[PDB]
Amino acid sequence: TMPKPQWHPPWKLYRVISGHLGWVRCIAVEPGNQWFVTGSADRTIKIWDLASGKLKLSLTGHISTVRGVIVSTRSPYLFSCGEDKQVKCWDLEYNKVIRHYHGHLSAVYGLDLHPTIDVLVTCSRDSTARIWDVRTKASVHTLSGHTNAVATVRCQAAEPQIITGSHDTTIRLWDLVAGKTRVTLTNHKKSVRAVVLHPRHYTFASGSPDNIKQWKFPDGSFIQNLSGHNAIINTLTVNSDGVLVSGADNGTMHLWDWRTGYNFQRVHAAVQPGSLDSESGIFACAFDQSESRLLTAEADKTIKVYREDDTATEETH
Amino acid sequence: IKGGVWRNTEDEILKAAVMKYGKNQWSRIASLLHRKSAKQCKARWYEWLDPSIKKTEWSREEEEKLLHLAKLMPTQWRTIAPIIGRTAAQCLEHYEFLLDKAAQRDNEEETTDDPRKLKPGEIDPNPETKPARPDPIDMDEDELEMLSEARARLANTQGKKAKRKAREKQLEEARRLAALQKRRELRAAGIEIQKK
Amino acid sequence: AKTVTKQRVESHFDLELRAAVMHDILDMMPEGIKQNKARTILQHLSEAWRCWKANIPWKVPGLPTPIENMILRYVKAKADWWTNTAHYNRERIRRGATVDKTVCKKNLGRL
Amino acid sequence: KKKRKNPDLGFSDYAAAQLRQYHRLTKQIKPDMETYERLREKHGEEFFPTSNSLLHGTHVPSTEEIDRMVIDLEKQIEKRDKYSRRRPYNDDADIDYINERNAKFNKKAERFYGKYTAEIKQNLERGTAV
Amino acid sequence: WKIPPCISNWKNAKGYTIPLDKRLAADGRGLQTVHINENFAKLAEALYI
Amino acid sequence: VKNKAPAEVQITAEQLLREAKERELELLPPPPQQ
Numbered sequence A: 001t002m003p004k005p006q007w008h009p010p011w012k013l014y015r016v017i018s019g020h021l022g023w024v025r026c027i028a029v030e031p032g033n034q035w036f037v038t039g040s041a042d043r044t045i046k047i048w049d050l051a052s053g054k055l056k057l058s059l060t061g062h063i064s065t066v067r068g069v070i071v072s073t074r075s076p077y078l079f080s081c082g083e084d085k086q087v088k089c090w091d092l093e094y095n096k097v098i099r100h101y102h103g104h105l106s107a108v109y110g111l112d113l114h115p116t117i118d119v120l121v122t123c124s125r126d127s128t129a130r131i132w133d134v135r136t137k138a139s140v141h142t143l144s145g146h147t148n149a150v151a152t153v154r155c156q157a158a159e160p161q162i163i164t165g166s167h168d169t170t171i172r173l174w175d176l177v178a179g180k181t182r183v184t185l186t187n188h189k190k191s192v193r194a195v196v197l198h199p200r201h202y203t204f205a206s207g208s209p210d211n212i213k214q215w216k217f218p219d220g221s222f223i224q225n226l227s228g229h230n231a232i233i234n235t236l237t238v239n240s241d242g243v244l245v246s247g248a249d250n251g252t253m254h255l256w257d258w259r260t261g262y263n264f265q266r267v268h269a270a271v272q273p274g275s276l277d278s279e280s281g282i283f284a285c286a287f288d289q290s291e292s293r294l295l296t297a298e299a300d301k302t303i304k305v306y307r308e309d310d311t312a313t314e315e316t317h
Numbered sequence B: 001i002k003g004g005v006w007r008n009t010e011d012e013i014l015k016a017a018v019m020k021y022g023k024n025q026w027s028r029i030a031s032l033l034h035r036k037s038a039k040q041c042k043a044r045w046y047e048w049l050d051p052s053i054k055k056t057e058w059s060r061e062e063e064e065k066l067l068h069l070a071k072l073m074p075t076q077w078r079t080i081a082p083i084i085g086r087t088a089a090q091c092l093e094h095y096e097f098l099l100d101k102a103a104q105r106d107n108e109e110e111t112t113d114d115p116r117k118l119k120p121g122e123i124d125p126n127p128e129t130k131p132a133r134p135d136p137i138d139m140d141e142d143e144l145e146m147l148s149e150a151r152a153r154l155a156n157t158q159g160k161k162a163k164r165k166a167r168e169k170q171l172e173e174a175r176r177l178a179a180l181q182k183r184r185e186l187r188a189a190g191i192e193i194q195k196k
Numbered sequence C: 001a002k003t004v005t006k007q008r009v010e011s012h013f014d015l016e017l018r019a020a021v022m023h024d025i026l027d028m029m030p031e032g033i034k035q036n037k038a039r040t041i042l043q044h045l046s047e048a049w050r051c052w053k054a055n056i057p058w059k060v061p062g063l064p065t066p067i068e069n070m071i072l073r074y075v076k077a078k079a080d081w082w083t084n085t086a087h088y089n090r091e092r093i094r095r096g097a098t099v100d101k102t103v104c105k106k107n108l109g110r111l
Numbered sequence D: 001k002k003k004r005k006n007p008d009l010g011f012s013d014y015a016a017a018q019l020r021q022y023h024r025l026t027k028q029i030k031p032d033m034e035t036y037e038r039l040r041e042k043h044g045e046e047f048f049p050t051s052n053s054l055l056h057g058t059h060v061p062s063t064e065e066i067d068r069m070v071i072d073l074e075k076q077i078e079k080r081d082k083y084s085r086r087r088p089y090n091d092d093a094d095i096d097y098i099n100e101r102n103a104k105f106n107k108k109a110e111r112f113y114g115k116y117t118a119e120i121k122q123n124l125e126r127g128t129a130v
Numbered sequence E: 001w002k003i004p005p006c007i008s009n010w011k012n013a014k015g016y017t018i019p020l021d022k023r024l025a026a027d028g029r030g031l032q033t034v035h036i037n038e039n040f041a042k043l044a045e046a047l048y049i
Numbered sequence F: 001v002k003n004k005a006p007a008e009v010q011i012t013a014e015q016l017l018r019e020a021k022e023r024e025l026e027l028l029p030p031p032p033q034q
Ligand SMILES: [Mg+2]
Pocket: none
């Protein structure tokens, strides 16, 4: 035992929200904890009340599965992307689409907003990531260099400003200004389907079905290797208390210590009554802005909501 | 002007056509057998040619379950038949045979009560439930032409575009050898005509 | 970059379904697999969809249970898309909304 | 007198067959001590190099070495080309194919589904019964 | 992890000829097992009485 | 004069398959020795 891990209280499901008619493929929380978006394969975007778990709005307009949804923090906007090939801005003042971002040759798998510049970045199946200006709806750069479908992308304000993993088992750390790759990290053996950024410690994590890896930001140094959750993992999310969540395609979800890399809880949730045993699966997970609720978008067309158990230490390895 | 009695030749072409086209394309099979429609081919398959149709002798527990189900579901042979594992026509025929072997023993001796109630001068309503006529020695133009079309359609796999491209490849090879001979003669005698 | 408008919709859906299945079987096979055999699993998925539409019970005698479970998952997803499209177009045909003639024939055939 | 048995198991990997093939080639080779001691006495201190000594861009092999390498590699190509031996083609079996690829696809079907579809073939050969 | 081939009841794209046991190898429609209830008996006997 | 009589051969499906294999309506001839 080289490290001693911080004790984290275990999590438990307390709310199963239902009402989508397709796999819930994305989730995102508003900056004020008043509501949260989901996007699903029933071609809609649903505003849910975060306190009561009640459907606040349903927004139609996609032609195919909704893959990524994000709410802007600087502007009152709602960006969404789909297998439609369509990337959209929803003006939440009007609940209508005002701008559509055109140029993806195939399906769009994820999107992220730059926190300070008003620049949208998108992943696509055509092996590219695109860089869009919000105001002028134009492609600034086309990040090319992956060879397979691009699965996940993130953004910083500090250095390398765009980090994306893809299905070619590589991860490229980029230059937003030039539009060229700075670091190609090839350590994974299977496809990287989730990258995630730590809020404080200036490191990041990346997940693939072999194992999950933690990495320094300036040039990508190896730091650690978090293993044991060996399924096809779809999302990773980080809590500022150092809780890491890994949700997989087989419904299994592990809870992890960020610092020491310790597995303190395994959660294998159950499917909805009508659903099937082969249909347990997690496509997205997100913490709220209070970082005390865990919202998981499941493959049984549900939203499951978790919170911490208030009972003291029955734990520590 | 379709149907009639099934011969062995039509049934073997039907077997080979199920081997080629499957059990979900009956109008492609019935194009291979004239004077037989797609419903007739489908019925003949499921009633005399499926190798799950038990053409063996009825056992004891089979006819016990037969009498139990026929007393249990009156005149419902399409429902009784998948339970006892026989064709509904065979199931009905053997049930009528078992009722004959009790009514004849209970009342009569051999005859006397109405000699014939069979079917003269008519076309049988279900000829797919009946075994196949053998093939006559002198097969006519219809049967031999049907066998020839059967072999010629069991051989083919290619469509229009593949067949025109194969002929186009042969024509390209022929015109290449012809231009080769012309150019070889022009270089052999020696005439330096250039081309475009 | 052509848009999926109205006559590309089913072809784009069935284009993306194949791609999602391809990514899942590239992630699902273990480390020492020959990395062939994708086309056969795609044919098993198409046959499983045909057997769902025909209401034929679909079982392959020898098949690995991750491939069989994944095919059942994606066949249930295409079933949901098919059925919700049928409900939507039936409500449109009932109210008298602007519908194509081909969507009337397709909707009758689904119902 | 010596005796050694080396059969093959299943395939399972592209590296295990490489390792078997390497052990075969590396047991077949014979070193020449004259050339070895000659190059050792010529090279001296650097004949036991590290990862990073100097000699990477220096060696020029004479004609006999490259001829031995080419002959060995031709033998290795021949041994690789003898990998898939053709099974003898009998025409007494009732053929169930109309093409050249149909026969091999029916062979693959008999490989995979041949263990499960063992009753129905008996039903066919006994006259579509049972 | 071996994947057997797909012998389809609909598509035969290269026009092959497949043996019947391989062709009708749909196990699920053979294990459907048409099984009856026991309350048919009470109904039929009560109607005859 | 045509005679109806039960035969002895009784042609089957595998005979049709064997006689259909030898039609060779798709095998293109090899190119000539040039
Ligand atoms: Mg045609």
